[PDB]
CSV table of C-alpha atoms and ligand atoms in Angstrom, one decimal:
chain,number,residue,atom,x,y,z
A,1,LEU,CA,70.8,95.9,97.9
A,2,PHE,CA,71.3,92.3,96.7
A,3,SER,CA,70.1,92.8,92.9
A,4,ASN,CA,72.2,92.1,90.1
A,5,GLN,CA,74.2,95.4,90.6
A,6,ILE,CA,77.5,95.1,92.2
A,7,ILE,CA,77.5,97.4,95.3
A,8,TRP,CA,80.5,98.4,97.5
A,9,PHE,CA,80.4,100.0,100.9
A,10,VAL,CA,83.5,102.2,101.5
A,11,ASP,CA,84.5,103.0,105.0
A,12,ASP,CA,87.5,105.4,105.4
A,13,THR,CA,87.2,105.8,109.1
A,14,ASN,CA,90.2,103.8,110.0
A,15,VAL,CA,92.7,105.1,107.5
A,16,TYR,CA,94.5,107.9,109.4
A,17,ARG,CA,95.2,106.5,113.0
A,18,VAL,CA,97.3,107.8,115.7
A,19,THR,CA,98.5,106.9,119.1
A,20,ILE,CA,98.1,109.9,121.5
A,21,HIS,CA,100.6,110.3,124.4
A,22,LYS,CA,101.2,112.9,127.1
A,23,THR,CA,105.0,113.1,127.4
A,24,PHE,CA,107.0,113.7,130.7
A,25,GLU,CA,107.3,117.4,129.6
A,26,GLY,CA,103.4,117.5,129.5
A,27,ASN,CA,102.9,117.9,125.7
A,28,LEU,CA,100.8,115.6,123.4
A,29,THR,CA,102.4,113.7,120.8
A,30,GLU,CA,100.2,112.1,117.9
A,31,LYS,CA,102.3,109.3,116.2
A,32,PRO,CA,100.6,107.8,113.2
A,33,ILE,CA,100.0,104.0,113.1
A,34,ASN,CA,98.9,102.0,110.2
A,35,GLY,CA,95.3,102.1,109.1
A,36,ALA,CA,93.1,100.5,106.6
A,37,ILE,CA,90.3,101.1,104.2
A,38,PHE,CA,87.4,98.7,104.2
A,39,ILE,CA,85.7,98.0,100.8
A,40,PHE,CA,82.8,95.5,101.2
A,41,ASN,CA,80.3,93.7,99.0
A,42,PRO,CA,77.3,93.0,101.0
A,43,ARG,CA,75.9,90.5,98.5
A,44,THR,CA,79.1,88.2,98.4
A,45,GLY,CA,80.7,89.1,101.7
A,46,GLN,CA,83.9,90.0,99.9
A,47,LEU,CA,86.1,92.5,101.8
A,48,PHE,CA,89.1,94.2,100.1
A,49,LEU,CA,91.2,95.3,103.1
A,50,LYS,CA,93.7,97.9,101.9
A,51,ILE,CA,96.2,98.4,104.6
A,52,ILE,CA,97.7,102.0,104.7
A,53,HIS,CA,101.3,102.1,106.0
A,54,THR,CA,102.4,105.1,107.9
A,55,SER,CA,104.9,106.0,105.4
A,56,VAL,CA,102.1,107.6,103.3
A,57,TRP,CA,102.1,110.5,105.7
A,58,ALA,CA,105.6,111.3,105.6
A,59,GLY,CA,106.0,115.1,105.2
A,60,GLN,CA,102.4,115.7,105.1
A,61,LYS,CA,100.0,118.0,107.1
A,62,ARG,CA,96.3,117.8,107.8
A,63,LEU,CA,96.4,114.1,107.7
A,64,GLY,CA,92.9,113.6,108.5
A,65,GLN,CA,91.6,115.5,105.5
A,66,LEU,CA,94.4,114.1,103.3
A,67,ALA,CA,93.2,110.7,104.3
A,68,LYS,CA,89.8,111.1,102.5
A,69,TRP,CA,91.8,112.0,99.2
A,70,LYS,CA,94.0,108.9,99.8
A,71,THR,CA,91.1,106.6,100.2
A,72,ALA,CA,89.6,107.9,97.0
A,73,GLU,CA,92.8,107.4,95.1
A,74,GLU,CA,93.0,103.9,96.4
A,75,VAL,CA,89.4,103.2,95.5
A,76,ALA,CA,90.1,104.2,92.0
A,77,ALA,CA,93.2,102.1,91.9
A,78,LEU,CA,91.3,99.2,92.8
A,79,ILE,CA,88.5,99.7,90.3
A,80,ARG,CA,91.2,100.2,87.5
A,81,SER,CA,92.9,96.9,88.6
A,82,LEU,CA,89.6,95.0,88.1
A,83,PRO,CA,87.9,93.9,84.8
A,84,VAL,CA,84.9,96.0,83.9
A,85,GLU,CA,82.6,93.2,84.7
A,86,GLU,CA,83.8,93.1,88.4
A,87,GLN,CA,83.6,97.0,88.8
A,88,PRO,CA,81.0,98.2,91.2
A,89,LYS,CA,77.9,99.9,89.8
A,90,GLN,CA,77.3,101.7,93.1
A,91,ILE,CA,79.6,102.9,95.9
A,92,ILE,CA,78.1,103.8,99.2
A,93,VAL,CA,80.3,105.8,101.4
A,94,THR,CA,79.8,105.4,105.1
A,95,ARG,CA,81.0,108.9,105.8
A,96,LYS,CA,79.9,112.2,104.0
A,97,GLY,CA,83.4,113.6,103.6
A,98,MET,CA,84.4,110.8,101.0
A,99,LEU,CA,81.6,112.0,98.4
A,100,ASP,CA,83.6,114.8,96.9
A,101,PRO,CA,87.0,113.2,96.9
A,102,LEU,CA,85.5,110.0,95.4
A,103,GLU,CA,83.5,112.1,92.7
A,104,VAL,CA,86.7,113.8,91.5
A,105,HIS,CA,88.8,110.4,91.4
A,106,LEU,CA,86.0,108.5,89.5
A,107,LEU,CA,85.3,110.9,86.5
A,108,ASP,CA,86.4,108.3,84.1
A,109,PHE,CA,83.6,105.9,85.5
A,110,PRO,CA,80.4,107.2,84.3
A,111,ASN,CA,78.4,104.2,85.1
A,112,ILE,CA,79.3,104.3,88.9
A,113,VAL,CA,76.9,105.8,91.2
A,114,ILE,CA,78.2,107.4,94.5
A,115,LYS,CA,76.2,107.9,97.5
A,116,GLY,CA,76.2,108.5,101.1
A,117,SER,CA,74.5,106.6,104.0
A,118,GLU,CA,73.1,107.0,107.5
A,119,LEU,CA,73.7,103.2,108.3
A,120,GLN,CA,75.8,102.2,111.3
A,121,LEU,CA,78.5,99.9,109.7
A,122,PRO,CA,81.5,100.3,112.1
A,123,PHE,CA,84.3,98.3,110.3
A,124,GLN,CA,86.5,99.9,113.2
A,125,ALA,CA,85.3,96.9,115.2
A,126,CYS,CA,87.4,94.8,113.0
A,127,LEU,CA,90.6,96.3,114.4
A,128,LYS,CA,89.8,94.4,117.7
A,129,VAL,CA,89.4,91.1,115.8
A,130,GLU,CA,93.0,89.7,116.1
A,131,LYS,CA,93.2,88.4,112.6
A,132,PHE,CA,92.7,92.0,111.2
A,133,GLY,CA,94.2,94.0,114.1
A,134,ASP,CA,97.9,92.3,114.1
A,135,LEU,CA,97.8,92.2,110.3
A,136,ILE,CA,97.2,95.8,110.1
A,137,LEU,CA,99.5,96.8,113.2
A,138,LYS,CA,102.5,94.7,111.8
A,139,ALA,CA,102.5,95.8,108.2
A,140,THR,CA,105.6,97.4,106.9
A,141,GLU,CA,104.3,98.4,103.5
A,142,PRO,CA,100.7,99.0,101.8
A,143,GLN,CA,99.1,96.0,100.6
A,144,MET,CA,95.7,94.7,99.8
A,145,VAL,CA,94.3,91.5,101.4
A,146,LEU,CA,91.0,89.7,100.5
A,147,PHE,CA,88.5,88.2,102.9
A,148,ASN,CA,85.2,86.6,102.9
A,149,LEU,CA,83.4,88.2,106.0
A,150,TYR,CA,80.5,85.6,105.7
A,151,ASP,CA,82.7,82.6,106.3
A,152,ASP,CA,80.5,79.6,105.1
A,153,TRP,CA,77.0,81.2,106.0
A,154,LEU,CA,75.8,81.8,102.5
A,155,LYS,CA,75.8,77.7,102.1
A,156,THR,CA,72.6,77.9,104.2
A,157,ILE,CA,71.3,81.7,104.7
A,158,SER,CA,70.6,84.4,102.3
A,159,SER,CA,72.7,87.4,101.6
A,160,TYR,CA,70.2,89.4,103.4
A,161,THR,CA,70.4,87.3,106.6
A,162,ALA,CA,74.2,87.2,106.4
A,163,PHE,CA,74.6,91.1,106.1
A,164,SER,CA,72.2,91.6,109.1
A,165,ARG,CA,74.3,89.1,111.2
A,166,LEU,CA,77.5,90.8,110.3
A,167,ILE,CA,76.0,94.2,111.0
A,168,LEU,CA,75.0,93.0,114.5
A,169,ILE,CA,78.4,91.4,115.1
A,170,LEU,CA,80.3,94.7,114.1
A,171,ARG,CA,77.8,97.1,116.0
A,172,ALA,CA,78.0,94.8,119.1
A,173,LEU,CA,81.8,94.6,119.2
A,174,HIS,CA,81.8,98.5,118.7
A,175,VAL,CA,79.5,99.1,121.6
A,176,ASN,CA,81.0,96.6,124.0
A,177,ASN,CA,83.8,94.6,122.8
A,178,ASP,CA,84.2,92.4,125.8
A,179,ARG,CA,80.6,91.5,126.2
A,180,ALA,CA,80.2,90.9,122.5
A,181,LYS,CA,83.1,88.4,122.5
A,182,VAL,CA,81.5,86.5,125.4
A,183,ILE,CA,78.0,86.4,123.5
A,184,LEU,CA,79.9,85.1,120.4
A,185,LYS,CA,81.6,82.2,122.5
A,186,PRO,CA,78.6,80.3,124.0
A,187,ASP,CA,80.7,77.2,124.9
A,188,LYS,CA,84.0,76.4,126.2
A,189,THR,CA,84.5,74.4,122.9
A,190,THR,CA,83.4,77.2,120.6
A,191,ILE,CA,86.0,77.7,117.9
A,192,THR,CA,86.7,79.7,114.9
A,193,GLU,CA,88.5,78.0,112.1
A,194,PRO,CA,91.8,79.3,111.0
A,195,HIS,CA,90.6,80.6,107.6
A,196,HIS,CA,87.3,82.2,109.0
A,197,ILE,CA,86.6,85.3,110.7
A,198,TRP,CA,83.7,84.3,113.1
A,199,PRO,CA,82.8,81.4,115.1
A,200,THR,CA,81.4,78.1,114.1
A,201,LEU,CA,78.0,78.0,115.6
A,202,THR,CA,74.8,75.9,115.2
A,203,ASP,CA,71.7,77.6,113.6
A,204,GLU,CA,70.2,77.5,117.2
A,205,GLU,CA,73.3,79.2,118.5
A,206,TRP,CA,73.1,81.9,116.0
A,207,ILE,CA,69.5,82.6,116.8
A,208,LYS,CA,70.4,83.3,120.4
A,209,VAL,CA,73.6,85.2,119.6
A,210,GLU,CA,71.7,87.5,117.3
A,211,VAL,CA,69.0,88.4,119.8
A,212,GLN,CA,71.9,89.0,122.4
A,213,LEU,CA,73.9,91.2,120.0
A,214,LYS,CA,70.8,93.2,119.2
A,215,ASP,CA,70.0,93.6,122.9
A,216,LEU,CA,73.6,94.8,123.6
A,217,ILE,CA,73.4,97.3,121.0
A,218,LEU,CA,69.9,98.6,122.4
A,219,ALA,CA,71.4,99.0,125.8
A,220,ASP,CA,74.1,101.2,124.1
B,301,CL,CL1,83.3,112.7,107.1
B,302,CL,CL1,97.2,98.0,98.1
């Protein structure tokens, strides 16, 4: 990572989502709720959040499988909307089921290398960060929203350090949301700016937070 090649991580985990309910009659219903594709540039912190509205599933079967294909279609659509100089050189899919759908959808983009990964990058943790969760839940149509997942960090730290910090945050939220949120609020006065994702912390506070997040992930 981090060279002069544009790299995107693509996480399709959260595209097809449902609420499972046991009815008074004893049967399970699985009603879809809105999902999202996360498309993430680890060098710049750019996130393209493509919100997937439940209308896309209307009249369809095997929604989990179809979701992989929907994701590939949407990644291709995003690429086509961008100038060539902004298109990724590499796409790293977080789940192996995306490899074949994305290959088939990107045949017109011979410069783009697609590969899988064993990295633990749980963008699903973002669903419990209110500023994404409510946005996704309340959407009434598909849309794409841009974010900067590194806030103002790159003013003083490298892309490598920023990526590592983000991964620790996401993995810790994933493992234990409530404890991660406490670690990320070290003082009564700790705030997150309205346009930021993460809290405003001193350098010293971040050092302590990063060790605590890592320990939380290790405890599993
Ligand atoms: Cl998969
Ligand atoms: Cl969109």
